[PDB]
Amino acid sequence: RDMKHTVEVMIPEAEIKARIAELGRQITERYKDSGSDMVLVGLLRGSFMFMADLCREVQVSHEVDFMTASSYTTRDVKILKDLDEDIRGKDVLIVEDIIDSGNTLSKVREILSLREPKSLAICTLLDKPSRREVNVPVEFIGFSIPDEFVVGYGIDYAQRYRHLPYIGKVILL
Amino acid sequence: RDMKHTVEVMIPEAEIKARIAELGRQITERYKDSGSDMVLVGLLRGSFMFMADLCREVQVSHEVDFMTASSTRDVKILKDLDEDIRGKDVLIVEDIIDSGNTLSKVREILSLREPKSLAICTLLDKPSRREVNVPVEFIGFSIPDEFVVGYGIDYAQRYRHLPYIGKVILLD
Amino acid sequence: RDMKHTVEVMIPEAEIKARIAELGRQITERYKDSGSDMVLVGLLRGSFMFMADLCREVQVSHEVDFMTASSYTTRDVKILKDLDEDIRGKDVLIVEDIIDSGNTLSKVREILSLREPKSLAICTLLDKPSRREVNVPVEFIGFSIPDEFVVGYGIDYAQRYRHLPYIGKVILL
Amino acid sequence: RDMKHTVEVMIPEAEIKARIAELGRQITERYKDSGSDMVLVGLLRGSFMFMADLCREVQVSHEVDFMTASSTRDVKILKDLDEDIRGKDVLIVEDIIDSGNTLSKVREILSLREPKSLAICTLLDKPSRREVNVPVEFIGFSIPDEFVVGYGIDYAQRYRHLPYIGKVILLD
Numbered sequence A, C: 001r002d003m004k005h006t007v008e009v010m011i012p013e014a015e016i017k018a019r020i021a022e023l024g025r026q027i028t029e030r031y032k033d034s035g036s037d038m039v040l041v042g043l044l045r046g047s048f049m050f051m052a053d054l055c056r057e058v059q060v061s062h063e064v065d066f067m068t069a070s071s072y073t074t075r076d077v078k079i080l081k082d083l084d085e086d087i088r089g090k091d092v093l094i095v096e097d098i099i100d101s102g103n104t105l106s107k108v109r110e111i112l113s114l115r116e117p118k119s120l121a122i123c124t125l126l127d128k129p130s131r132r133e134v135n136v137p138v139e140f141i142g143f144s145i146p147d148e149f150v151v152g153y154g155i156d157y158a159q160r161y162r163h164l165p166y167i168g169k170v171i172l173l
Numbered sequence B, D: 001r002d003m004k005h006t007v008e009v010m011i012p013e014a015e016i017k018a019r020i021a022e023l024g025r026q027i028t029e030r031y032k033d034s035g036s037d038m039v040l041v042g043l044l045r046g047s048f049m050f051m052a053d054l055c056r057e058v059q060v061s062h063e064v065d066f067m068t069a070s071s072t073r074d075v076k077i078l079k080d081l082d083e084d085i086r087g088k089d090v091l092i093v094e095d096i097i098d099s100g101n102t103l104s105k106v107r108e109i110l111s112l113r114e115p116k117s118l119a120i121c122t123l124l125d126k127p128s129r130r131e132v133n134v135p136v137e138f139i140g141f142s143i144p145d146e147f148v149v150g151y152g153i154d155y156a157q158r159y160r161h162l163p164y165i166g167k168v169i170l171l172d
Ligand SMILES: O=c1[nH]cnc2c(CN(CCCP(=O)(O)O)CCCP(=O)(O)O)c[nH]c12
Pocket: A044, A045, A046, A071, A098, A099, A100, A101, A102, A103, A104, A105, A106, A148, A149, A150, A151, A155, A156, A157
């Protein structure tokens, strides 16, 4: 949190926009013939930018909701802020910025599943298979990256760089 | 919500105090030799009073925590617990169980956090209106099909401060 | 949080019950001729036991509500859980377990005051004038104690002793 | 909530994108020489999209935080901020201001935490329905008295994902 560093571009703004466009088309095809109500659920705070760009590329009538989970050395996954709307009998797509361990995301899916939605999938922008500690079903993935320390596009470093339009790598000096 | 009514006594303060003492001895005897941390989890708002009196009758070192749930519809968490319950003996403390919809869903959520044991203690039980068969190990009173008030329990945000359990009787 | 210790009785269960009875009579006289709706507001978690005993000794029709404030090195006072009901045009009595610095309580009163209640008073069970860092108006006080490390009656020590029916002092060994 | 209607365009995506770029340069020029930490505070849910596009146009190192408020009645905090704002330049990011009741009360609450500066940036402003004179330093569009949807803003939880601002037109 307190180290001399700099930031290089890893995934340019244009690459993200192109990849999200594709994701939008995939998500659209998977839920266009569903009929039931659909809702995209974002995990604050990292997902807000990804959510904003993604939901615009989804050509299906859907709702947008958010929830906040507890961040932590091993502790219970607690809900700091639940969803505003109901999800039972609905198509729910959890929208994440990045999956590493998948601990929090695994628990969140369990909690949501109890509310018995019609379907329940996960869409993450970044994925680190390397750091996975729990196997979680992830239907849509934007980028698979090695264990690199990335920032930008909602992802922070000591609350910094959330507003970068590009995914960047931090170089410790 | 604005209906003319009266409140008759159903369970006097002395009866509650005595029954809670008994519940205390039973809860104590169950968890006294556990060797794992114990926590009483109250469901706000209606159970604050029951919780305060109950934990004072529980002669084992335990923690006290609270949780606020919502409402048919989905059961959402307005205020989650403050502390972890993983590997702990958890006792859910609820004021009253009518249908059991809320308890059922709250127990599910907490069970996901893998506590050593998960049990429920309710002051009032109204089995004539149960829709879901939830398992309760401690019950203070099984009551008739009456709309009860007092002791944390309210009627339109009214009567929570009554030291006794009463029943609402509407005028004709 | 990790020290060898023991607990002695400082304020017996019976003394608390007697003092709360008196508080109930005072509070009752101050608000019996008000007319407006009344609500007792408790600060979780320390206030739950004090709230339960106090509201029963208040012979005035009132509502009971709770809220949780952020606990922390100097940080913003944040609301982890707000009130469930409205308080504008009402007689509001904040119910606290203990006042030391009065930092959190001062901010909480400010936040609540913005909602424009008819009146706004504070009732605490214990008071340490010694440790006061901010001057806060406190209309009702159960006990004034010196700077002693107390537990019990909702007050904890590493989440312990909340359930003690008596106010106790911890003796570090 | 269940009324038959249509959605006509009021502000096209290109117009929003261009206007947000301008807002970006203005916000940047104001806070570029502050020397104090900056934070954009969004009011959920309706402002997530505006926030995402806006902060990408703000060329100063800042933090992004969110807050959920309620609704007449009292304005309560369902979800408070995650980080402190004391001694920081705070910019409240809101989707639309009709009456201004919520903004007015939210600004009051945040001001209590004594930030270095407290300002408001709204995408849409509908002054024909303002009940409280709240001070806004940045406004994307001042709009006619129409029920707008899209770009985070909803009609009965619908249309939040539209890349443009539209207006709801009921059928006769
Ligand atoms: O490369 C990173 N940059 C910044 N943060 C992180 C994290 C920690 N974490 C992000 C931080 C969450 P926050 O402190 O913003 O609430 C990712 C965990 C997602 P998962 O448990 O479901 O897999 C993991 N990797 C990174």
